[PDB]
Amino acid sequence: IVSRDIARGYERIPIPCVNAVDSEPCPSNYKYVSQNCVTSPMNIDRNITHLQYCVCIDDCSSSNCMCGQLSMRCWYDKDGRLLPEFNMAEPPLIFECNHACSCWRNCRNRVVQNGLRARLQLYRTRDMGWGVRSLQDIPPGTFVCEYVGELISDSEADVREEDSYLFDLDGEVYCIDARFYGNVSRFINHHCEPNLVPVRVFMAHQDLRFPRIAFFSTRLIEAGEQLGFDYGERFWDIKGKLFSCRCGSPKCRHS
Ligand SMILES: COc1cc2c(NC3CCN(CCCCCN)CC3)nc(NCCCN(C)C)nc2cc1OCCCCCN
Ligand SMILES: [Zn+2]
Ligand SMILES: [Zn+2]
Ligand SMILES: [Zn+2]
Numbered sequence: 001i002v003s004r005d006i007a008r009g010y011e012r013i014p015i016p017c018v019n020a021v022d023s024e025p026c027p028s029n030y031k032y033v034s035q036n037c038v039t040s041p042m043n044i045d046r047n048i049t050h051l052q053y054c055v056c057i058d059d060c061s062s063s064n065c066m067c068g069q070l071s072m073r074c075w076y077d078k079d080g081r082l083l084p085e086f087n088m089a090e091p092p093l094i095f096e097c098n099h100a101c102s103c104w105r106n107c108r109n110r111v112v113q114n115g116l117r118a119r120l121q122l123y124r125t126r127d128m129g130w131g132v133r134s135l136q137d138i139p140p141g142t143f144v145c146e147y148v149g150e151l152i153s154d155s156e157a158d159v160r161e162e163d164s165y166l167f168d169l170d171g172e173v174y175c176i177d178a179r180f181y182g183n184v185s186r187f188i189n190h191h192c193e194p195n196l197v198p199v200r201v202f203m204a205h206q207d208l209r210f211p212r213i214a215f216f217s218t219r220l221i222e223a224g225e226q227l228g229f230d231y232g233e234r235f236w237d238i239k240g241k242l243f244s245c246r247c248g249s250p251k252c253r254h255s
């Protein structure tokens with residue numbers, strides 16, 4: 001246990017850092033942030049009159065909810081987990097209720113905006129690197145964590161040497177660079193048969209150029225199991241020429 005909480009209390013629950021492999025301290029060559037940040041101007045559309053919202057008089061569990069319609073339909077069940085019908089292979093955009101909605105803060109269409117609910121842990125792996133794992137079982141379709149970092153423009157990401165922490169939000173594209181500023185997600189390793197899938201979500205604003213990346217479990221994740229997600233083709237078309245994926249999956253597509 002090299003750190004009581006890498007989030008310094010910014011998350012709803014601590015994210016401890018342990019090392020049972022060697023004596024290396026907890027990573028400290030980056031700034032931990034719980035929400036996305038920018039290192040320049042960024043004209044995100046936060047005009048409240050531009051927000052589409054609902055006028056539900058219930059807990060937004062009816063087919064009339066405008067926010068559910070924008071999401072195709074509300075995909076969250078009573079527990080806040082994605083319904084079985086959710087398409088993990090090609091996730092729809094999710095629009096959660098916002099402050100312009102007539103509903104209450106505890107309505108059904110609010111999950112990602114409620115923050116971290118799982119017991120996660122940053123840990124030293126065998127390959128002398130770092131990974132993240134759940135310390136509890138996590139049912140399928142559960143929101144685990146958001147991919148947080150430095151929001152930057154495509155051209156800006158194009159002049160950065162270290163590109164191993166980028167995440168594309170594919171006119172005019174933007175990326176999230178978790179190299180200098182990032183949250184626990186910057187430590188999740190790649191996996192060809194991922195237990196985590198990224199979903200584009202909109203909460204306080206609905207500027208389509210700036211979706212927020214939420215990781216939902218693709219199946220039951222057992223306590224102690226390491227978290228992972230598919231980095232994608234761009235990552236491997238570039239890094240594939242430097243090393244082979246070691247996710248160790250019988251279906252590994254990058255080794
Ligand atoms: C590591 O894998 C990734 C690399 C990326 C990258 N790399 C470039 C390579 C060339 N240098 C050039 C360096 C020049 C240096 C000059 N001193 C700048 C960074 N650029 C961009 N977007 C910008 C592409 C240009 N646009 C015009 C299309 N996105 C990337 C997304 C990646 O997968 C992310 C997958 C998830 C991984 C999560 N950890
Ligand atoms: Zn509603
Ligand atoms: Zn609502
Ligand atoms: Zn709403």
Ligand SMILES: [Zn+2]
Pocket residue numbers: 191192245246247248249251252253254255
């Ligand atoms: Zn692999």
